[PDB]
């Protein structure tokens, strides 16, 4: 299943709480909370390049599924982990007490990051 494309953020939930619990500066949280930008996925076989607009920052990350990767987090911190496919439409990984699920259903990509009882959910639509 092709994940490739550009996706417009439509709605999200718990941006503020989630950014607070990972330690993002309050200034950046205020500036970033209502920015609904475009994120992009470039897939090539098992390799993925993610360019993610989140608040006032754009972060680039890549990985090959199944292989270990180094990911840059929102605070800038770097973490070792691995990303796996769960089925044909779901990308799942974990780091820094966070479980992340990225599911693509047609033109809608749902991203759910759970940290404690905070569920940071982002819904985006293919453009």
From Swiss-Prot:
Its main location: cytoplasm. It comes from Homo sapiens. It is found in: Cytoplasm. Changing residue 94 to A: Increases the binding for cholesterol; increases high density lipoprotein (HDL)- and low density lipoprotein (LDL)-mediated cholesterol uptake. Forms a beta-barrel structure that accommodates hydrophobic ligands in its interior. Plays a role in lipoprotein-mediated cholesterol uptake in hepatocytes. Binds cholesterol. Binds free fatty acids and their coenzyme A derivatives, bilirubin, and some other small molecules in the cytoplasm. May be involved in intracellular lipid transport. It holds the Pfam family Lipocalin_7. One of its GO terms (cellular component) is nucleoplasm. It comes from the Eukaryota. Belongs to the calycin superfamily. Fatty-acid binding protein (FABP) family. GO terms for biological process: cellular detoxification; cellular response to hydrogen peroxide; cellular response to hypoxia; fatty acid transport. The modification Phosphoserine is found at residues 11, 39, 56, 100. GO terms for molecular function: antioxidant activity; chromatin binding; fatty acid binding. The gene is FABP1. The modification Phosphothreonine is found at residue 51. The modification N-acetylmethionine is found at residue 1. Keywords: Acetylation, Cytoplasm, Lipid-binding, Phosphoprotein, Transport. This is Fatty acid-binding protein, liver. The modification N6-succinyllysine is found at residues 31, 36, 46, 57, 78, 90, 121. The keyword Acetylation applies.
């Amino acid at each position: 299943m092709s994940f490739s494309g550009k996706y417009q953020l439509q709605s999200q939930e718990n941006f503020e709480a989630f950014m607070k619990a990972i330690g993002l500066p309050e200034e950046l949280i205020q500036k970033g909370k209502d920015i609904k930008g475009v994120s992009e996925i470039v897939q090539n076989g098992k390799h993925f390049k993610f360019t993610i607009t989140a608040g006032s920052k754009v972060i680039q990350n890549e990985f090959t599924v199944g292989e270990e990767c180094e990911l840059e987090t929102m605070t800038g911190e770097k973490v070792k982990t691995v990303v796996q496919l769960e089925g044909d439409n779901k990308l799942v990984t974990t780091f820094k007490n966070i479980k992340s699920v990225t599911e693509l259903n047609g033109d809608i990509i749902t991203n759910t990051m759970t940290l404690g009882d905070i569920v940071f959910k982002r819904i985006s639509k293919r453009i």
